[PDB]
């Protein structure tokens with residue numbers, strides 16, 4: 001069963017508009033196609049076109065990505081599957097905007113109604129909504145694990161400084177599993193605990209960016225939500241579901257050495273070509289997320305692109321990479 005791949009183009013910023021930039025990207029949501037102008041001036045051109053599971057043009061709003069991509073995944077998480085969503089693309093294209101979003105300016109909104117909110121805050125908000133009173137008892141735990149230069153950092157441990165690296169071990173009770181020693185899991189007890197947890201992470205990040213060169217563009221971040229669920233039948237028996245969701249904001253795909261990024265692409269290549277050795281163990285990212293790449297987790301990729309002709313080569317590079325990734329076969333199953 002193919003993983004899901006979608007594409008999102010960012011809108012032009014002030015600078016580009018001021019320059020009367022014209023888009024080289026066309027997304028047709030009916031055909032589910034992205035089409036890129038690769039040459040030719042006005043009245044005759046070359047184009048490259050690619051079909052994906054969905055396509056989101058530059059005017060697409062957060063709410064629409066959330067309804068289309070995330071809603072059905074969260075439903076699956078709530079059924080007790082593990083899911084992963086990746087954001088993939090060059091720096092500046094909207095990976096973080098998609099996975100996190102931002103605040104609407106001038107304190108126009110509370111966080112729960114901000115139309116610029118992204119996947120993470122909307123998902124956490126929605127979990128409490130969907131499970132308010134349906135007879136499922138539940139707890140929600142989050143962790144935020146980052147990988148930079150092949151070291152692991154915990155962005156939510158409030159009593160460790162950002163300099164302290166975690167260690168990873170194989171998890172003996174699990175072929176596909178690792179243990180991250182020391183990784184804080186924070187219980188989010190209700191919707192009114194969410195925002196401040198997101199705040200503490202962001203502050204812990206600022207610090208990281210100060211210590212580590214080009215941190216925000218070279219790091220991979222894995223924001224995990226684990227939902228432990230318990231139903232009681234009419235006969236008093238207990239039904240347990242556990243769902244895990246990984247929300248991954250990857251390092252920029254552009255262009256010193258990102259071992260985890262290089263390995264991710266080599267993992268995809270091995271999977272699509274069906275070669276029997278898949279090099280998961282060659283990087284921390286791919287050991288942690290091994291079950292997401294041709295294993296038992298339902299995976300989606302959101303590949304983010306630019307409308308600007310300056311970014312032509314990296315745009316094509318992302319589309320090609322994303323398009324190949326569609327042939328990855330996963331076998332989701334209940335926990």
Ligand SMILES: Nc1ncnc2c1ncn2[C@@H]1O[C@H](COP(=O)(O)OP(=O)(O)O)[C@@H](O)[C@H]1O
Pocket residue numbers: 009010011058060089090091092093094095096097098102304
């Ligand atoms: N769909 C969008 N709508 C409005 N602004 C966007 C969108 N996508 C990206 N941006 C803006 O583009 C800039 C870079 O986006 P960012 O999320 O940091 O990209 P990345 O994480 O891929 O480097 C930011 O100013 C962000 O606000």
Ligand SMILES: CC1(C)CC(=O)C2=C(C1)NC(=S)N[C@H]2c1cccc(O)c1
Pocket residue numbers: 099100101102103104111112114115116117118120121195198199202
């Ligand atoms: C609260 C912050 C300091 C700044 C910020 O915009 C975000 C943060 C950190 N983190 C989340 S994951 N995305 C966004 C976010 C969170 C909630 C609502 C929103 O519109 C955006």
Ligand SMILES: [Mg+2]
Pocket residue numbers: 095096097216217
């Ligand atoms: Mg980013």
Ligand SMILES: [Mg+2]
Pocket residue numbers: 216217218219220221249250251252
């Ligand atoms: Mg990142």
